[PDB]
């Protein structure tokens, strides 16, 4: 589908040490490409994909300055939030934000988003119109009125329609050789003991990019999504992904079953069976 640029902020309070920790990561589609960690000595925005390293020192200086400022805002914010909820000063709490933009087929913002959570629960979110907020509880209504008073939504909207999309387009070109090239899965079928009446057939897809994939088992043309065991798609460690789908079949009936693999890296879907 549509390409995207997304940032993920996690701030955590640490009362024992009297401070907080702020970690940010950025993704284009399913590829992480930057990080910032307030715990790092002299913390900077750092590259985490090869293609972003061609950005010059001005880019890294600017990104570092924004993340340092944002780290401080989320540090004070954690203190405000503890007060809003009258929580004890000894507990650790978590303040998260995520925001990003999807690229439309016309090169415009397809969908922009900005959301926040406190202790893992939705706190406040920018509405689809990029003009108003939805607050989850009494505490978040305090934040909502402050941000309405300061016209915060207009700046989120300008960033999402403007710099987010323009920088996404730039990254997509800089990293075209990996971001815009589908890597098809390497596939194979294994067989394993299961129980009294059945052996397990497991259909593996390794090393694919992007993340989206379809693995299905089909008993004689009709889909077997009954007790197909399907693991969550997991990272390979090299920027690609892995998945498998398994099902228990009658001993001696293995060759009646077919695994169908659809992925945008393949010219046409695959049909695998037990050897």
């Amino acid at each position: 589908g549509p390409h995207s640029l997304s940032y993920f902020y996690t701030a955590v309070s640490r009362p024992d040490r009297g401070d907080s920790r702020f970690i940010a990561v950025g993704y284009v589609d399913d590829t992480q490409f930057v990080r910032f960690d307030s715990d790092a000595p002299n913390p900077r925005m750092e590259p985490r994909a090869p293609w972003i390293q061609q950005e010059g020192q001005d880019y890294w200086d600017r990104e570092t300055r924004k993340q340092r400022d944002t780290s401080q805002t989320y540090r004070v914010g954690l203190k405000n939030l503890r007060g809003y909820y009258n929580q004890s000063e000894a507990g650790s709490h978590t303040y998260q934000s995520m925001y990003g933009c999807y690229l439309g087929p016309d090169g415009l913002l397809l969908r922009g988003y900005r959301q926040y959570a406190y202790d893992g629960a939705d706190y406040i979110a920018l509405n689809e119109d990029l003009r108003s907020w939805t607050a989850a509880d009494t505490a978040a209504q305090i934040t909502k009125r402050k941000w309405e008073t300061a016209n915060v939504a207009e700046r989120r909207r300008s960033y999402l329609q403007g710099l987010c999309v323009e920088s996404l387009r730039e990254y997509l070109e800089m990293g075209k050789d990996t971001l815009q090239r589908a890597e098809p899965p390497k596939t194979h079928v294994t067989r394993h003991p299961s129980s009294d009446l059945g052996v397990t057939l497991r259909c593996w897809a390794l090393g694919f990019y992007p993340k989206e994939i379809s693995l299905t088992w089909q008993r004689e043309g009709q889909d077997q999504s009954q007790d197909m065991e399907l693991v969550e798609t997991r990272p390979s460690g090299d920027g690609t992904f892995q998945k498998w789908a398994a099902l228990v079949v009658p001993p001696g009936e293995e060759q009646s079953y077919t695994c169908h693999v659809q992925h945008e890296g393949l010219q046409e879907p695959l049909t695998l069976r037990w050897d």
């Binding site: 924004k66 944002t70 805002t73 914010g77 405000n80 915060v152 710099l163």
Partner: peptide, 9 residues
């Protein structure tokens, strides 16, 4: 590129 700054919660 990240957002330039945001207002306190």
């Amino acid at each position: 590129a990240t957002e330039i700054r945001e207002l306190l919660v």
